[PDB]
Structures are given as C-alpha cells and as structure tokens.
Assembly symmetry: C3
Homo-oligomer: 282 residues x 3
C-alpha cells in the first residue's frame, strides 16, 4: 500500500477545510447512475484531480468528481465515477476514498453498480438488492486489506458474513413496496470478477454454479474497506443485461447497452436511493 495513515488524514482535513459540508452518508454511483448527483441541494463539486492524494482518473471520460450536498434530508458525499481494478489501479487506490469518507465522519456507505444477470429470473431493468457477495479476486490475494493492518481503521481479520446491513435491506424491501411498483425488488448474491473483457459461456456457467445472481467488476473492495471501518453498508445492482448462458444465442454483451439500460430504467434507481435516505438512521 502506497498510502500512510497521514495521507488519508491530510486528504480528509483538506476536504473538511474546503467545504462547510459534513457528510454522514457516502454514495458511490455505478455506471450510468451518475445522474443521482442532480438531486443534491446546496451541492458543491470537487474534481478528483484537485483533491490531494486522490487517484487521478486516467481517461474514462476525464469525468471524476466528489459532490457534497443534501439528499432527501441527509448530508451526503457522492462519487460520480468510481475506480476499477481493470483500469490498472491497485485495490488500495480503488478503495482510498472509502477510508477518506470514514475520516470525514461518514457512517454509512451506499454502493450502486450495473451488473450482468446470472439468475434467469432477472430481466433487463431489474434492480437487485445485494444480500451477499463472492469475492473471487480476494480468494487469490486481491483484497484491499492486504498488507499491514492499521488498528486506527479496524481489526486484522474483519468479518464479512454480515457485510450488507440486514436492517437496511428490510427497510429497502419495505420502501420499495410502500411506493407500489410493478416489478418486485430482486435480491441476491453479487460476484466480482476483474474484467475488463466480458464472460464466456463457460465462465457464465461457472459463476451460476457458484451461486452468484449478478456479475460486475467493482463494489466488493469498497464494501470490505467500509466494513473494516465500521461503516453501515447497503447497495444494489441494476441488471443491464442477461449474460449469455448457452451457445444457442448469437448476441454479445457490450458496454454500449449497459449505458443504455442505465439510461431508461436509470432514474428508477435514482428515486429509490433518494427516498431510501429517510430510512437511514443518524
């Protein structure tokens, strides 16, 4: 890890002295979900590039910013553009923001992402509440906590079986119903794979056989660092496509559609997140 405790501290204090905002809830916007930033009020934008120690967003579109504001009665800080292992960043950079949030005073992390559906019951547009995850990269060594542990953040061996807050998941399922929606709110296991190339049929079958319901290339690292910090964690995936699971089909998964699904059924997640803020204690 190239960061010392001092680095996270200096970044936090810099942000704290450059904004009057004092966030409680940190929100990481997934692909095609950045619009969520338009709902904040008293918004204050910071480009990643101007924040000390922040990983500088190479060329996804040069759009990387931290937005502080209020979302439905709660002090928030949103990440529009998140870092991925596939871009070359080691996991300790990918999750650097998370530790910064903790030092800013955040106690809750909401993570969102787009994902391929592995469970056949899913349909494009569906929203999957994350009940659990399978950290394939972590099994091999790619775990954001690798390296000496700093007691100031947490313990050497944090547990992850209760990573996704049960209370929030319940309140989430409730909220979704209180709103009265067509499709039900899906729930399941998210499996992380490094990417960036999409899965083959054989691989799709492997992930299904392991019990995963949705597949993506992010999130798990941020969740592990958040939990290591003591943060309350809740999140979901926007199923942007159904992964090909048999050779009959003659269609390919593309980053184009993922942003397209995250175009129509996108605002659906946005509203759900804003409303869900009232369900977050303080």
């Amino acid at each position: 890890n190239g960061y010392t405790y001092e680095d996270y501290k200096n970044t936090a204090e810099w942000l704290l002295s450059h904004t009057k905002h004092r966030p409680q809830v940190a929100i990481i916007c997934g692909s095609g979900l950045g619009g969520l930033t338009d709902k904040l009020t008293q918004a204050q934008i910071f480009d990643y590039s101007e924040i000390p120690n922040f990983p500088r967003s190479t060329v996804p579109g040069h759009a990387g910013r931290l937005v502080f504001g209020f979302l439905n009665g709660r002090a928030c800080v949103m990440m529009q553009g998140r870092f991925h292992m596939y871009e070359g960043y080691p996991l300790w950079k990918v999750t650097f923001p998370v530790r910064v949030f903790h030092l800013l005073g955040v106690d809750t992390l909401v993570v969102t992402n787009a994902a391929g559906g592995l469970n056949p019951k899913f349909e494009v547009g569906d929203i999957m509440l994350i009940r659990d995850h399978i950290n394939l990269p972590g099994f091999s060594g790619q775990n954001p906590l690798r390296g000496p542990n700093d007691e100031r953040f947490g313990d050497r061996f944090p547990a992850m079986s209760d990573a996704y807050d049960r209370t929030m998941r319940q309140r989430a399922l409730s909220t979704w119903k209180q709103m009265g929606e067509q499709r039900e709110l899906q729930e399941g296991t998210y499996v992380m794979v490094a990417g960036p190339s999409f899965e083959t049929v054989a691989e799709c079958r492997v992930l299904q056989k392991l019990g995963a319901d949705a597949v993506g290339m992010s999130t798990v690292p941020e969740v592990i660092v958040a939990r290591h910090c003591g943060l309350r964690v809740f999140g979901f995936s926007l199923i942007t496509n159904k992964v090909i699971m048999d050779y009959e089909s003659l269609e390919k998964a593309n980053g184009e559609e993922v942003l397209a699904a995250g175009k129509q059924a996108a605002q659906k997640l946005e509203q759900f997140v804003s409303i869900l803020m009232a369900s977050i204690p303080l």
Copy 2:
C-alpha cells in the same frame, strides 16, 4: 503495462523491413508441437532475442524464434516457443507478440497447446477442438487487458462469448472427417490455471465440476488479446495425459510424458493444421 503503442509499432515496422514476407495467419505452437515449423516453405527465421522489444526467452532451452513462411497456400508467421505466466512474465509481455502480429497485417490466430484431460471420455493422443475457455486467472485480475485501453487496438470491454470462430470450428470438424480418421475430433472447454506445479486430485475435481474438459497454463491470454484486436481465432489442445481424478491411482503427471505424447501423436496435429489452412478465408 510497460509497452507504449509506439513499441508495438516499432517492432512491427522492424520486422516488416527485415522480411519481404507479409503474414496473414499467425500460429502459436504449443509444447512439443514446434515441428510444425518444418512445413513452411521460403522460411525465414528470427530469434526472439534479435527482435526489438520482444521478451527474451530466459532458459526454457534458449529456443525462441519467429518463423515467417508459407503453409499450404497461406502466408504465415509461427511462434516456436511461447511465453508463459509461470515463467515470471506479466501478461502484457506474454501477449506482446499478438499485438505485433495485428500490426503486421495478420487477421487470423491459430493457437495450439498440450493439455491434461479432465473429461473422462478423452484419451492420451486425442485432439480437442477448443469451443470455449474458463479464464481463472482473469477472474482475479490477471487479464492481459488490465490497464488503460488503447482505442487503436480495440474497445474497453470486448466480448469473449464468441472468441472461438464458429465457422472455423465447423470447417475443422469437416476437414477432420474429409480426411477419414480413426478417433473422432474431440471438442470442449479449456481452463487456464497459472501453474507451474501440476494439479492435485482435489483441484482436478474442482476443474471438472466447473465444466472444463482440458487444462493448461497458456493460450487464454493470447486469445483475449487477439479478439480484442479483431483477429479470427481458432485452436486446439493435444491431450498429453489424463489428470488423476481419484486417490486410487499411484501415478504422477510429469513434463516428461507431455513432451513424449507430443512426440508420437504430434505430427498428427501438424498435418491437421497445415491442411486446415485451406479452410481459412483471406
């Protein structure tokens, strides 16, 4: 990645100005399949060591060369000796040649390798057409495309579900029959594991349970980079041994036998490849 676009370009131009040959089909010879180089005509050999930017073959036997020539009516470039992740090379070096081939004007990549048979229906000497692959290293981060993407080669998120050209696989199965052979042409999923040590019984069972038919320590990376490039891809594995899948057996897998199987039933693959060249469009 330690290579800049310029590096691949300079290597291509160097080769292009040192040979009159202009290859269309690149062929990577697997273990004990190097003999395939003896079939080229108007052959011109280049030691890896003399080609700018090429990874220098440590000590597999110091035998690493790029051979340009004609194979059954087609301009080829063959790799005699391929790079493996287990030797210490990062994946961006392992696949460096592939991007060079694309800049040389190659539009087809034929990959061959020796592999352990996981499917019980296989026998030593069998030839397995590769229909799909399981990229275990890729799930964890070891994917040759990790790092910033260069649009000149391809897209950020290339698909792999159609990696192995369906047309060539069909024409391959046809060719094999047109020849009238004893054993049928096997077909299945290739699973890549890093190695270099051989699998345990428990591991063999894992790979079988995942749906893999053959196991090796190469190929998948080259295939992913080729596809990212737009190359047509086809290949197969020479089953050199049947992996031990139960504790009853008292025999061990050894690099000795692998080269031995690749001694008798070796030329069988060689001919098949030469003849298959006529089935490759232009």
Copy 3:
C-alpha cells in the same frame, strides 16, 4: 523472486555455523500452536530479525523465531510465527524458510495451522489430517514457484497429487488410535484463500461446493516449495470454528476465538505432534 540461490545458501551456512544443531524435521507452528516449542530440549532460539535474508516480521506481535532442538528423539527446527500472503509478503518470501531448511539438511516438513471448518461433520476442537489441498491463489498466478526454476532445488513442473505423504497419514491415523482418544481423527481437503477478511456465507458455500473441508490462509505455499525440494510432507488443521454457511445464524468469525480454541484443545495437537515424531523415519 528477489532471492538468488546464493541468498538461500548464505542463510543456511550462517545458521549451520551458529548452531551445532543439524535438524532433520522442520516444523511450522500455526496460530495458537506456538507452545509446541516448549517441548524441545537443548533448545536454541534465533530471532528471525537476526537471521540473514529472513523476512522481518512486521507487527503480528514482533514474535518471530526459529527454534532448534530435539523433539521426542528427532533433531528439529521449529518456526514459531509463520509468514502470510495477507501481511503483504510475496510468496517467495513466505516460503523462503522452506528452501533454507532443505539446505540445512531437513528431509521432512510438518505443517500445522488453525482453520475454519467447512465440512458439517466437524466440531470446534477437532483435528483434521490433511489429505489434499485446493490452491485457489495458485490457479491465478500466486504460486511460490512462479519465475525461473532453479534445477538445484527441483524440476520446472513438480507434481502435487501426492503432496501429503500417504505413509505418514497412515501412521498418523494409527498413532491417534494407539493413544485411544475420544473424538476420531478427521481427514480432508484444505482450501487456501488469501484473506485477511473472513468469508461470507456465499463464499462459504462456494468453498463447500468445491469439496474443501477446512479453510485457511497459509500452508499450501510452504507445501508446494517443500515438495519441489523433495521433502516428505505431512500436516493437519485445528478446527477453531465452524464457518457460517446459512443466513439463519447471527454470529461472526473472529481472530479472538481462533486463538481461544487454540488455547484449550491446543496442547492436544502438541502432544500428537511430539509422539508422531517417532513415526518419522530417518
């Protein structure tokens, strides 16, 4: 790999000239099993920090030492405190001691560790004889033999299907009975995961579906290097906890209990190891 053959040699010769002891059996003590060092006679302690080239134990408790002595009629060398991939050490440092032992004249390696039980038949306190292992990190590239092979230690492609000496496992099962004990001696497959965070329910299910019986974050690397060396290998796991495999449960795995289980049923393993020394040929 940052070590040259010379480095292992110089470390061996340094130890050989600083102790009259000439070990035959090397023993690696797992978590909460360090007490085994109290049974040696004519004991001579070396701090890891004073041994040339040894990885310096960061801050697990600053307790890292190599103890030479005699254990029940056999010249031993014990590692009190072992290195883990999760602490940041690359595998070639984690396994550095193993190659040193081989140069000291050791011909047998006994590895012990604490592990989470995946097989439901297990209970806290149980002892599991290791019959086989699943090297998840190894599938992805994290194998201690990655990099050029040195013929002086072993072959390029060593087999692992017979890693755990069948004779010792038999003599172990015998010994356990000759002693007449309540609980039977368990036996099964050990799966290595990098850690340091504990498994989620979904992950627990994956590991079970793969056929693993116990889960830990060490051992496999040392075993592979030992075998590559020609060392006889035998070992076992102390089940310190039963991994949560369903959402009903409301308890979390913690490094606290692991050391606690390794407190009561700890000496049970210690005696078993001492007595088992008589079963090790010479």
